[PDB]
Design a protein around this ligand. Structure first.
Ligand code: UD1
Ligand code: UD1
Ligand code: UD1
Ligand code: UD1
Ligand code: BG6
Ligand code: BG6
Ligand code: BG6
Ligand code: BG6
Ligand code: NA
Ligand code: NA
Ligand code: NA
Ligand code: NA
Lengths: 352, 339, 352, 340
């Protein structure tokens, strides 16, 4: 039924999200069980620090979950792009837990980084889609994310499944804390609702197709504004627009600079702002106000029912269900996957 | 004086500010660094779980620019945080953290809020600050005043190079008990000695940069800066300067990870991916501007801005200077009053 | 009604034990709250290691509780005699939590050690009986054990009270652990019963006076055998007999040497063996057997109902109630306090 | 020309001390190189703490060297008796470096402790005499102490050889420190002289035989007083007197609350002086192990002196133990005990 494997894979996300969780979460009793990390959790916690290492969209899934790993575990977590980690020859030691995230399990820079960590005596953990791939075999332990084969040229379902697996890993690490139990239960109940909420978000495709057929087609760049949990989503949206749509895109930390890119943009530059409640900071509102003050006409991804910009000012809304704060990225990325897909179609590009 | 603007003056002041930052703190003959503010705190800093560097804007750049040398010389985990994002994530900190705050003014709101957060959590706090007795200077437990003198220009020029130098001295101080580091120490200190005179030499690129800025470069809507490794910070800081001073969009891009283009191709950061990126550009006849070491031919049409070769971890101090001059002259050519 | 303050203090222990716990343990909800440490616990929970530092009987209360601190917290715990700590110039750093235990809060070696740790930037915690004593003032935080004044020349109720305060501190450090919950509850329900069980143990006094009068008064030395939880009890009993009674005494790790002191003993040298269930190791049984075979007749401290040796093989029994393993030393020490006291008074030695 | 393997083994110590160092110390350039640990040191240096785990005399060699490890490395070091470590079910984790010291490499409690540590993911290092014994094989890395086979029933040369191997291990761990370079050179130059100093100490044998011919040999107990570096020597002396001489003995922390007191300069604390003064106040006739030429007790109190050469403070125990080995041996002979 689908024009392309990429469209199929985006639309497959209710099912891949469920498949990632299948057999791993008891939603009734709120227990996460990751069999691959079985005899290893008590060791993983006993480390100086967690280093998340990955490339491209897999690196963004690490950015998207860093905060919740930090929050739930109180272990320091850093996130490294594999090639830059290697370029810096960043010291790694026996007391580090190195977490490698990869859809393919074959990316050269990820494998080189893994070899570097292994030879230095670090504990290694893989979060990998392709079962038995190099990264899966070579990591000490890990989780196969169970998204199924990905044939689109860019990662869609693997991103949402990686993010979910990383959240389950964070929950697993913090499963002995009385003080975390309410937070755990909140997040696990939220996860249970993700697959159906993804289905809801997919109903935005018509509005997106329309927007992609608009003046948007002709524009040469698109800027995405995000802060907090949604900065990763802004970076991933930009990567998608670049890798798939062959259009220039940058993810911008919203409102960080008063006199940055937003003071420079043309009236008609496409700007997407993430304004869901989890990441609705004063600086986000300032950035959005700055755009509208200059007569810009931004596209706002926000929660159902929220009016971020007055009806008096021209702007586009793409409304998404509200979920638990640290899970909102799973829903907010979907319109970007669809926008990047339909822009590439509007332009004649093959995405498989 | 001879200077059109405060910003131009402060750019040209860098041989002196770089010297002043080192003054009384480095014995170049015996290769000994002595930072009076940190003296009795070093043993405590050396034993922490991790160092978190926390800063905004150009000061965040100076942390990125020196992250690798801290890691290399100390083998302590070092992370670099933008103050607002650190606060947005509510990143946990604890007694065993050493939090290093870098700020020219010592008054930036987000940096102060971040310091107060770390203090309340019981972390050890260290300031690298220009303004003596500012909030950040007072409220950190210990620190180094960078001694760059007052900064009047709207964007940081001398404060970036002086912060970077102060951070390198801090890294050297932390690792001054290591026999295996001694050769690397001496190399960096002998390098630092020559920085002020090398900065004088790089400032002689101004006329070449004026010629470049008189061209259609000054009419462009975007300028991309490509760098990797030590020079990625320099790419980010060049981008920030072009945005903040020249009012032109600019982006610092990690070279070859995935319109005028500036590429950093000095030897310290001349990776395969940089060469690949540069090849991609020349293949489409892109005409890149290449910042490279004196005498190197990185490309067989392009513009070359040659800079003296220094110790790898110090190359960013010389590479940033043409970007400061480009952002300044682009602004002048576009009729912007930089002050 | 007491002959000496020391006797009064020994008999005061049901009340001092209760007074130490008062306002600090919710026995129904199994919650421990130590006001003086409350705001400091997350900091202590985080350190590289705990160093317990003390002199004499206070040093023994640290040995008596070292295992339960290690078990409940999984933080390394070492136990230092203050003078030897200072003699070795053991390095201490900002990441150490140094726990100082002292009845008087004034002992020179403990104060010197505290000053050394403070100057090195370590976090310091006091467990002290004398409110506002030097050690109470100078530590960063602490617990006043609330045992009341001791006038006896040797510590009795302050030993049991210190030991209880130390167990409460360990419970407080581990009060966020789901996996520890059952063990927590076990110990707290145990602590609730300690004051009445001490009342029960104190009923051994007449049998102990008989034993001193029939078998011990004329003696020049006595050996205490103990292992595991009861090794500290054996050392403290030895100290009491030395300090109070002016008789030689040695605490011996039971069955450690096949040809050590037990291979050398007479059949009339008095030997006390701790054989309560919590510390009834094979090596303890072997030691006892090495004694009865040599025709030594050991004095066996054991749980009510237990027959450790044959009635065929001659021995004296002092039965004590069974409590939780890590609490059994609180009851096992009491017969030793009473023995040392009666030995002293039967020799016209003042104990106050 | 020896009566027993024990006596031979005591007298072999100049050679065993030399053999333990052979090929591992460059005394000219002051460099220690332990082949067995080469590429493991950077990892050993990166642990939360070091736990030294051993039984009997090997436990004492750990006590004897704890201070120098802590001094030189600034890593926390604890010393555990293997059986008690197991009795407590002491938690250990991936970030622990567990160091096992054993002459035989077969002692049951040390083996069980090793297996417990290995199961918990700890890094394990062996300091072992018997090449290819269980503990030699099962530790991740280690140093064979190269003392030669030990046939005496109690450890004599293995103690001084284990102690020297442990000091070399601490030197190796700290070989990157500029601030400790002077202390390193001092210890290494001191190690060079230990073999010939042990020869010197063995010349006390005749004085010791005279002492053991006295009514010392029909005593029921002998107390040994020591503090600091010499507390381990007092504990090891007491063990030797119990295991060999069949006489009760206790090693006592001097001044904490027949007498041999260690009063060498490395461990001449006020509390040691005060303890000795208590004995001479009662005209108790102590036996004093002290450095050559030091008068610890004046001649108006009766006492016996056993002078030993002064070495570097942390090495003094290597010499101070030798008279106790000889005392335990000659007491047994005078008591008709076959020490073998
Ligand atoms: C593919 C596979 O055999 N998975 C089985 C596993 O699923 P389960 O979900 O338990 O395990 P995973 O597929 O996640 O992991 C399989 C194994 O590979 C390791 N690993 C995985 C990813 C990685 O990047 N690195 C790595 O080392 C894990 O530690 C584990 O040993 O147990 C279930 C039985 O209950 C079965 O339904 C599955 O057939
Ligand atoms: C400010 C001051 O009087 N500096 C004097 C100091 O310079 P010196 O270079 O020794 O000290 P700095 O100016 O770097 O620092 C001064 C004090 O401020 C603290 N600190 C500094 C920066 C910071 O951000 N946070 C912070 O706490 C330092 O720990 C130190 O206690 O001795 C010199 C002579 O030896 C004098 O010429 C300088 O006038
Ligand atoms: C002295 C005081 O007013 N104590 C009150 C406190 O007891 P609470 O049991 O809370 O506190 P403690 O008496 O144990 O400690 C008093 C203070 O002294 C500090 N400290 C204590 C011991 C030590 O060795 N070092 C040290 O620094 C503590 O951190 C605390 O700040 O609240 C109780 C009600 O809950 C009152 O009944 C107590 O009268
Ligand atoms: C046993 C052996 O062949 N040793 C050789 C080794 O001595 P060298 O002194 O290098 O090594 P050791 O004999 O100390 O140790 C041999 C090996 O056993 C390991 N180990 C040792 C003891 C222990 O308790 N646990 C443990 O794992 C070491 O890590 C090493 O891998 O190189 C020398 C050549 O330069 C040879 O003269 C020695 O014959
Ligand atoms: O997740 P993987 O298989 O390690 O691949 C990482 C990245 O590899 C390349 O950079 C791809 O173009 C990206 O789309 C992909 O995300
Ligand atoms: O270094 P400081 O005083 O904390 O200021 C940080 C940043 O603050 C502001 O953004 C300035 O415009 C920047 O130029 C500056 O780099
Ligand atoms: O517990 P405190 O006050 O520090 O005293 C410690 C020790 O000090 C001295 O050693 C006393 O004789 C002991 O009985 C006492 O236990
Ligand atoms: O050093 P090993 O072979 O582990 O032996 C440890 C102890 O084992 C036994 O206790 C021996 O009797 C002691 O002499 C010895 O010291
Ligand atoms: Na694997
Ligand atoms: Na300050
Ligand atoms: Na206090
Ligand atoms: Na081995």
């Amino acid at each position: 039924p689908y024009k392309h494997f990429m469209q199929k894979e985006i639309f497959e996300q209710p099912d891949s999200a469920f498949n990632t969780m299948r057999g791993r979460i008891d939603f009734e009793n709120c227990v996460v069980t990751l069999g691959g990390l079985k005899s290893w959790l008590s060791t993983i916690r006993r480390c100086r620090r967690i280093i998340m290492i990955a490339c491209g969209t897999s690196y963004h899934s690490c950015l998207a979950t860093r905060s919740i790993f930090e929050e739930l575990t109180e272990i320091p977590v850093s996130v490294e792009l594999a090639s830059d980690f290697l370029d810096r020859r960043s010291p790694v030691f026996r007391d580090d837990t190195c977490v490698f995230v990869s859809q393919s399990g074959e990316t050269a820079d990820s494998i080189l980084a893994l070899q570097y960590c292994l030879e230095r005596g670090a504990l290694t953990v893989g979060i990998v889609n392709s079962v038995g791939s190099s990264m899966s075999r070579q990591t000490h332990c890990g989780v196969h994310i169970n998204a199924g084969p990905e044939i689109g040229v860019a990662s869609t379902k693997a991103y949402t499944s990686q993010y979910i697996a990383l959240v389950m890993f964070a929950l697993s690490l913090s499963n002995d804390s009385i003080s975390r139990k309410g937070r755990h239960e909140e997040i696990i109940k939220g996860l249970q609702k993700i697959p159906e909420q993804i289905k809801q978000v997919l109903k935005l495709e018509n509005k997106i197709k329309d927007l992609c057929n608009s003046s948007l087609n002709d524009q040469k760049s698109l800027l995405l504004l995000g802060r907090g949990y949604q900065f990763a989503t802004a970076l991933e949206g930009a990567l998608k627009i670049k890798e798939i749509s062959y259009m220039h895109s940058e993810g911008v930390l919203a409102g960080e600079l008063k006199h940055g890119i937003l003071a420079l943009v043309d009236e008609d530059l496409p700007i997407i702002a993430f304004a869901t409640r989890d990441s609705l900071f004063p600086k986000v509102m300032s950035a959005i106000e700055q755009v509208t003050a200059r007569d810009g006409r931004p596209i706002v991804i926000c929660n159902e029912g929220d009016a971020i910009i007055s009806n008096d000012k021209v702007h586009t809304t793409l409304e998404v269900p509200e979920t638990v704060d640290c899970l909102q990225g799973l829903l907010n990325v979907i319109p970007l996957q669809l926008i990047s897909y339909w822009l590439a179609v509007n332009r004649g590009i093959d995405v498989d």
